[PDB]
Every structure is written in C-alpha cells, then in structure tokens.
Ligand binder design. Structure first.
Ligand SMILES: CO[C@@H]1O[C@@H](C)[C@@H](O)[C@@H](O)[C@@H]1O
Ligand SMILES: CO[C@@H]1O[C@@H](C)[C@@H](O)[C@@H](O)[C@@H]1O
Ligand SMILES: CO[C@@H]1O[C@@H](C)[C@@H](O)[C@@H](O)[C@@H]1O
Ligand SMILES: CO[C@@H]1O[C@@H](C)[C@@H](O)[C@@H](O)[C@@H]1O
Ligand SMILES: CO[C@@H]1O[C@@H](C)[C@@H](O)[C@@H](O)[C@@H]1O
Ligand SMILES: CO[C@@H]1O[C@@H](C)[C@@H](O)[C@@H](O)[C@@H]1O
Lengths: 87, 88, 87
C-alpha cells in the first residue's frame, strides 16, 4: 500500500498528511475548510513528520527515507529546504 | 513481515491511542491512566497514521487508513468514528 | 527502505527520530545545537512514537514491532524502561 504520516496544530485545526507513493512523497492540507495539495514534493518510500509552533509560525520536519538514506525536509514559512539531519 | 503502528497522546495523565495495521486490519489499543483496553476503532488498512488535537478537554482524532493507493480518513469527535472529507 | 518515527517538544525545539534498520531501532536527537545519537537502542522492524510534557518534564513512548509483537519503551527523565502496553 501507500505509506502516510500526519501532523496537526492549533484547534481549527490545521492538518498536513504526507503520502509516500511510487517513490514520491506528496502533501494534502486542511485549515478549517476543504482539502488542498501542499507545496511539499520530494522523493521517498517511507515518511515521518513532526511540527511545532514558534508563536503563530508553524515549523515542519519531514523525514523521507529511500533505501538506508533518510533526508530531513524543513518548512519554516518560505519553502521546503534540506535539513542537517543524519542517521 | 511485521505489523505497522501509529501512536498519539494528549494531556498530562496521559491518554494514549496506538493503532496497529495487521494483515489488512487496523485495531486500536487505549490507555487513560489505568491499564490498556481495546478501543472502538476497527477499519481495513495495510498502513495507518494518526494525529489528534484538544478543544478544551475534548479530544479530536484523525486516523488515515490506506489500502493500495486509497487513503480513508476516520474521525473521532466524542460520539463515534465517521468517514472524513480527506481525499488524495 | 528504513522506516522512521519522529516526535518533537518545546519551541527550540527538541526532536527525536527513531529508525528501524535491519531489525535494529536507533535514536537521533536534536536540542538546538546539532544531531547526536540517543540512549534508545531496541530490536524492531517497525517503530512509532508519541511524547508529552508534564510541566517541563518530557515523557516518550516508543512502540517497537517484530512480526505481530509490539513492545512499548518508556522515557520518564532517567532511562528507557519496559512499558505495560500489550495487543
Ligand atoms: C501555506 O503552505 C501550506 O502550508 C504550509 C504549512 C506547508 O504545509 C506547505 O507545504 C503548504 O503548501
Ligand atoms: C536549524 O537547523 C534546522 O532546524 C532544526 C530544528 C533541525 O531540523 C536541523 O536538522 C535543521 O537543519
Ligand atoms: C472513549 O472511547 C475510546 O477513546 C476514544 C478517544 C477513541 O479512541 C475510541 O475509539 C475509544 O474506544
Ligand atoms: C469537520 O471535518 C472533519 O474534520 C476536519 C478537521 C477534517 O479532518 C475533515 O476532513 C473532516 O471531515
Ligand atoms: C537526555 O537523553 C536524551 O534525550 C532523552 C529525551 C532521550 O531521547 C534519550 O534517549 C537521549 O539520550
Ligand atoms: C505508568 O505506566 C507507563 O506509562 C503509561 C503512560 C503507559 O505508557 C504504560 O504502558 C506504561 O507502563
């Protein structure tokens, strides 16, 4: 099957669901209305996620695994960038 | 090969929910500050993820159950498990 | 492919990433000044994690699965101990 990971924040709430499918991770988003496709699109067969609020600003870390290599992807409001995580 | 689990918790007691995908079936184990018991959640799936949030003292849980390329969202809001609006 | 589970707490933040690799689950840690190897080391092919704060004290529960047997490991400030979880 496809593999998913989920995070949420606040009380509305905001939800982000990540799906690993055919070597690619994509993102679906809800913020109190309908679902929409998120900006996140990077390779992976396995995915985990965690998020935290710095005041009103959400920060997301997505851990994308292909073989024995896990790449950390960072959302800090402006774009998805590679993090310094190593195994 | 092995079962696949997802976990969420809330408050300081705490309350914990663990979801296990086992040979195409997802079941739920629960702790609320005593022992473990089997929860009301039972739906098909080979893969499960979960998130939860509090509105005051009221827990809201979203479980994402996947079979092949089809992900179904299940919603706990205090009364029972309902299918959610999630699509992909 | 390796399988990961991620949790975070606070606003720095603190992040823990658990990786199941060839029947071994290991832990990588970030507390605001780089990644280091954590004290968690247990057998398993699948891992999930949840954590919560009681005031300023962090508690972690890691669910490690081999076949159909899931073992819960507990961090409560001092060390990793066997939890009461069964299925
Ligand atoms: C506003 O942008 C949306 O929300 C952010 C928190 C991220 O999840 C991003 O990928 C998504 O497209
Ligand atoms: C500032 O560093 C960035 O954010 C931290 C919270 C970590 O996710 C780290 O790997 C990443 O490079
Ligand atoms: C009160 O009901 C128990 O706790 C709820 C929060 C849900 O996890 C439900 O499946 C479980 O049976
Ligand atoms: C009220 O709507 C329900 O809860 C939202 C937070 C979303 O999970 C949505 O898909 C679901 O149908
Ligand atoms: C202080 O010790 C570090 O942080 C704890 C919260 C645990 O993740 C432990 O395994 C790790 O070595
Ligand atoms: C106090 O009991 C310990 O912590 C609880 C929150 C549960 O994780 C339980 O399985 C564990 O034995």
């Amino acid at each position: 099957s496809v593999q998913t990971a989920a995070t949420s924040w606040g009380t509305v709430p905001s939800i982000r669901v990540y799906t690993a499918n055919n070597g690619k991770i994509t993102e679906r988003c809800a913020d109190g209305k309908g679902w929409y496709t998120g900006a996140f699109n990077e390779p992976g067969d396995n995915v985990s996620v965690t998020s935290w609020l710095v005041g009103s600003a959400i920060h997301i870390r997505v851990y994308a695994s292909t073989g024995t290599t896990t790449t950390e992807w960072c959302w800090d409001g402006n774009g998805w960038t590679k993090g310094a995580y190593t195994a």
